[PDB]
Design a protein around this nucleic acid. Structure first.
Lengths: 69, 119, 279, 155
RNA sequence: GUGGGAGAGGGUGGUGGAAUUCCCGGAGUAGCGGUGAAAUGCGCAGAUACCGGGAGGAACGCCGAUGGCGAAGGCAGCCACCUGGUCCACCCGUGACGCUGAGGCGCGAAAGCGUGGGGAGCAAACCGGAUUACCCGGGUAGUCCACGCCCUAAACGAUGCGCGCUAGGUCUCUGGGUCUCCUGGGGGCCGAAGCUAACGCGUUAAGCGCGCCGCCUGGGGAGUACGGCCGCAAGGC
RNA sequence: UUCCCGGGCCUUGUACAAGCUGUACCGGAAGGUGCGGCUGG
């Protein structure tokens, strides 16, 4: 599916709303492409900026470990 | 001796070698083995079979120190990754978690000439 | 011989060749070999040069390092009698003995060679190093290198080879070989140069070691102030900076001069200057 | 063979015993198109075996053959300008072929004067689990499993 | 002029994490590294693999794109300040105030130079190992910063700038509206008429026209010679 | 059918009576390497 579809209404510029932002990160703490998030470019740009900001604030992980083979 | 009975395993998988290091929860290594320790030299060290024997040998030693179960962490993307995981899985230790921990730069130091040309 | 080359290669089941005739005579014309002068050839190959050389040579010594090419030297040089093959590497040999032995009856020798360039320069350097009593050398040696051998003291050619040879011998470009004469086009031009030895060194023999050391030091960072070159490359020299500044004054060489723009005379003066003053 | 699968020739079953393995063995013995000589040699060896051993020669021969069947072979393979002895599993066809050829070679290498004697001795020894044939089989197997490092060249 | 919009446009400060190297502490022992296969090298003064702390330099993974911005060169972590260009809507103000431009003046990748710092990784020259180059292990300049030079290129869309006219279809970035659609500005593919020696171009023209600038006149010799200007020099015009 | 030899087909660079380039070096230059750029592969 898509991350946007698997979500209600929310703000993209909210750099503290961790519960929604975590939905846009893969198993590893990496930003998902538009292929997965299902956003327009402007939306993707704003989301990536916010993600980086939250990363700095320590709320979101820069990197992590995938628990598989 | 240590009789920790529960530790973890670090599998450094390279293109040239595979090294398995068994360790306590605290991270202090207890025993280790590689492709070279078995007796292989040169390119033979890189083979998946070498990785299998390395994993089995390290596991046997760790059992001799009285372990029962580990938590395997794999680093690198060499040719002995899956073979080492499989070997350690059925060696008798009760592996609980398999974790990928490949350390990659965030576009840091400039790589060697052979590894450059990357877009 | 272009027509005969194919025949000879095919007749044995068989690499750059001077197939053409006129110029092989011209190179020895410049080489000036007679019944009075013998020849040491190190790159005889198939013997293309050797035939026309021995047509007017006093004595012919040839060095072949590979015995795969050996079986064909005799039968291709059947009529000629002057030929004597020493299946020895010239670098690993002792040319002094061979000079004393084969050409004892003969009068003079002038080396004429045609060998791959990756082997050329070390051989010439060795033949110069050991002070052999031979008249001269004639080699075609990748023109871009020959210019560096001659190398008037500027224009991107005056390096360190230039100083060595001009300290040992005289050099001047003799002939340009037009491309494509070789059956495989070598994508590069070659030049026949001649070296003529001299009686003793060009300049002071005060310290060969220190002279060459200074030569190497001044040309490490070619694009650089000579003073910077010396303070960098010359051993320590950081704490001896003031000494260098001192010595450069009385030698009448300016600090900011880009050592690539020096003469052998100036280099000799500086070699004498720094030695016995630096330590 | 680039196109087909090269179907195996069906050998006529033996007349004395009525099995194909004996026919194959006789063929493996026969040289210069002398088949009568090979048959006589084989039957003389069978008589010797029967005379000096409790059970029928046919069982001895069959189980000796089964005893000299290798499973792992090394094949020469070119990878990166290097020659590697890759381990492979051998099909029953190749198994039987190698078994019979090795048995014959080992029999012919014995110091006994008469061909029948040599054949009988080799068959009896391979039945027991020793001799030239079994030894060569074991060496072939041990040449594999000693270079399992290259097995990933599936080949 | 008013209202709004997008952006790795530029400069100055300041901090975030990943990774490599090195130092210290712990635990543990015989290889590690590298190749097509090996060697040089490192290691019993304890190397590799592991955990914890510290030092420093350089570059910013995912998003990231056939994307965006700039006159070109070129420009990617994030925050703030200062600042340039540009698009759209309203159609409010001036009333031809315009286009181009020999000289001049400024900017100008990389590689180089001078005066001082800095130096983790990589790495010309150089030093060794295998096998002619290639490949492997080390390694100075250099790569980084400040100031001052240098002024070159496959500096390219090999296409000077401005304006007007000449079928469309499709993808995409970004504004506006009366939002199935319509109307602006960028970036790409396929194609009417037409053009071209051909390849191909084709509303982002290499079509049809007007204005201004630059440049060409057979190849080699030759971007060489001499002269002049500039540069510390290499060299540039 | 991986390799040896030969023949044919599809796609691709030179001659038929992967390179290139600015700059900087090169005492194993038939040319090589370092830092960038281009496709005229």
């Amino acid at each position: 599916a898509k991350v946007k579809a698997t979500l209600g209404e929310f703000d993209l510029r909210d750099y503290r709303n961790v519960e929604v932002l975590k939905r846009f990160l893969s198993e590893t703490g990496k930003i998902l492409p538009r292929r997965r998030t299902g956003l327009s470019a402007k939306e993707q740009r704003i989301l990536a900026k916010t993600i980086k900001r939250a990363r700095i604030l320590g709320l979101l992980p820069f990197t992590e470990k995938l628990v598989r083979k | 001796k240590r009789q920790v009975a529960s530790g973890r395993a670090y599998i450094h998988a390279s293109y040239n070698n595979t090294i398995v290091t068994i360790t306590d929860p605290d991270g202090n290594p207890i025993t280790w083995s590689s492709g070279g320790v078995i007796g292989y030299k040169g390119s033979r060290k890189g083979t998946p079979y070498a990785a299998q024997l390395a994993a089995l040998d390290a596991a046997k030693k760790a059992m001799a120190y009285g372990m029962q179960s580990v938590d395997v962490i794999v680093r690198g993307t060499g040719a002995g990754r899956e073979q080492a995981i499989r070997a350690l899985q059925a060696s008798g230790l009760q592996v609980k978690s398999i974790v990928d921990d490949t350390p990659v730069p965030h576009n840091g130091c400039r790589p060697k000439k052979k590894f450059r040309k990357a877009s | 011989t272009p027509i005969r080359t194919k025949e000879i290669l095919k007749k044995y089941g068989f690499q750059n060749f001077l197939i053409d005739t006129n110029i092989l005579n011209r190179i020895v014309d410049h080489a000036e070999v007679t019944e009075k002068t013998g020849v040491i050839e190190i790159g005889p190959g198939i013997g293309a040069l050797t035939e026309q050389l021995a047509k007017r040579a006093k004595k012919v010594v040839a060095f072949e390092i590979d015995q795969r090419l050996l079986p064909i030297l005799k039968d291709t040089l059947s009529p000629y009698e002057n030929v004597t093959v020493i299946h020895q590497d010239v670098l690993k040999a002792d040319v002094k003995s061979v000079i004393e032995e084969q050409f004892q009856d003969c009068d003079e020798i002038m080396v004429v060679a045609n060998l791959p360039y990756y082997v050329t320069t070390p051989i010439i350097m060795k033949l110069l190093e050991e002070h052999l009593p031979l008249k001269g050398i004639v080699v075609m040696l990748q023109k871009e290198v020959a210019e560096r051998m001659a190398a008037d003291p500027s224009s991107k050619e005056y390096g360190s080879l230039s100083i060595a040879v001009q300290f040992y011998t005289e050099a001047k470009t003799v002939m340009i070989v037009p491309k494509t004469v070789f059956v495989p086009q070598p994508n590069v031009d070659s030049a026949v140069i001649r070296l003529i030895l001299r009686d003793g060194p060009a300049v002071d023999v005060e310290n060969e070691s220190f002279f060459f050391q200074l030569i190497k030091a001044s040309f490490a960072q070619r694009r650089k102030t000579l003073l910077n070159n010396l303070v960098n490359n010359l051993p320590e020299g950081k704490a001896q900076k003031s000494t260098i500044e001192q010595v450069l004054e009385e030698t009448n060489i300016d600090g900011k001069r880009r050592g690539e723009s020096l003469s052998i005379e100036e280099f000799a003066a500086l070699s004498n200057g720094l030695y016995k003053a630096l330590f | 063979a680039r196109r087909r699968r090269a179907e195996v020739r069906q050998l006529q079953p033996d007349l004395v015993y009525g099995d194909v393995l004996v026919t194959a063995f006789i063929n493996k013995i026969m040289r210069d198109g002398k088949k009568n000589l090979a048959a006589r040699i084989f039957y003389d060896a069978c008589k010797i075996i029967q005379e000096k051993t409790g059970q029928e020669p046919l069982k001895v021969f069959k189980q000796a053959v089964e005893n000299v069947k290798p499973r792992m072979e090394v094949r020469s393979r070119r990878v990166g300008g290097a020659n590697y002895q890759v381990p492979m599993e051998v099909s029953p066809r190749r198994q039987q072929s190698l078994a019979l050829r090795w048995l014959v070679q080992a029999a012919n290498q014995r110091p006994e004067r008469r061909a029948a004697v040599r054949i009988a001795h080799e068959l009896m020894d391979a039945a027991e689990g020793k001799g030239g044939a079994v030894k060569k089989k074991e060496d072939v197997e041990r040449m594999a499993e000693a270079n399992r490092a290259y097995a990933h060249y599936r080949w």
